[PDB]
From Swiss-Prot, chain B:
Subunit structure: Homotetramer and heterotetramer with GRIK5. Tetramers may be formed by the dimerization of dimers. Assembles into a kainate-gated homomeric channel that does not bind AMPA. Can form functional heteromeric receptors with GRIK4 and GRIK5. Can form functional heteromeric receptors with GRIK3. Interacts with DLG4. Interacts with NETO2. Interacts (via C-terminus) with KLHL17 (via kelch repeats); the interaction targets GRIK2 for degradation via ubiquitin-proteasome pathway.
Organism this protein belongs to: Rattus norvegicus
Protein's name according to its UniProt entry: Glutamate receptor ionotropic, kainate 2
Protein family: Belongs to the glutamate-gated ion channel (TC 1.A.10.1) family. GRIK2 subfamily.
Tissues expressed in: Highest expression is found in the olfactory lobe, piriform cortex, dentate gyrus, hippocampus, granular cell layer of the cerebellum, and in caudate-putamen.
Highest taxon of source: Eukaryota
Further remarks about this protein from its record: The postsynaptic actions of Glu are mediated by a variety of receptors that are named according to their selective agonists. This receptor binds domoate > kainate > quisqualate > glutamate. It does not bind AMPA without coexpression with GRIK5.
PTM note: Sumoylation mediates kainate receptor-mediated endocytosis and regulates synaptic transmission. Sumoylation is enhanced by PIAS3 and desumoylated by SENP1.
Length: 51, 35
């Protein structure tokens, strides 16, 4: 169980790993042209990151 | 995302009770064996 838990997560988080996971936090400047792109252009993973 | 928990006393404790029961059964049959 320990090895499966520590191997299920991708060792290098990518443009999709962060969206599905919750252990690792992510963020950017408050409406500093980053989340302004996140709110519009509704991509599934990008929508998850925006939420 | 939190599953890195070991088997504590509460997680696995009944094994101690069952082995103690086996030990007491073994001694209880051994004392009667000498009869």
């Amino acid at each position: 169980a320990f090895l499966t838990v520590e191997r299920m997560e991708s060792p290098i988080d990518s443009a999709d790993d962060l969206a599905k996971q919750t252990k690792i936090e992510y963020g950017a400047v408050e409406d500093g042209a980053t989340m302004t792109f996140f709110k519009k252009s509704k991509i599934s993973t990008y929508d998850k990151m925006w939420a | 995302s939190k599953e890195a928990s070991a088997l504590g006393v509460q997680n696995i404790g009944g094994i101690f009770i069952v082995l103690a029961a086996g030990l007491v059964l073994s001694v209880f049959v051994a004392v009667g064996e000498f009869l």
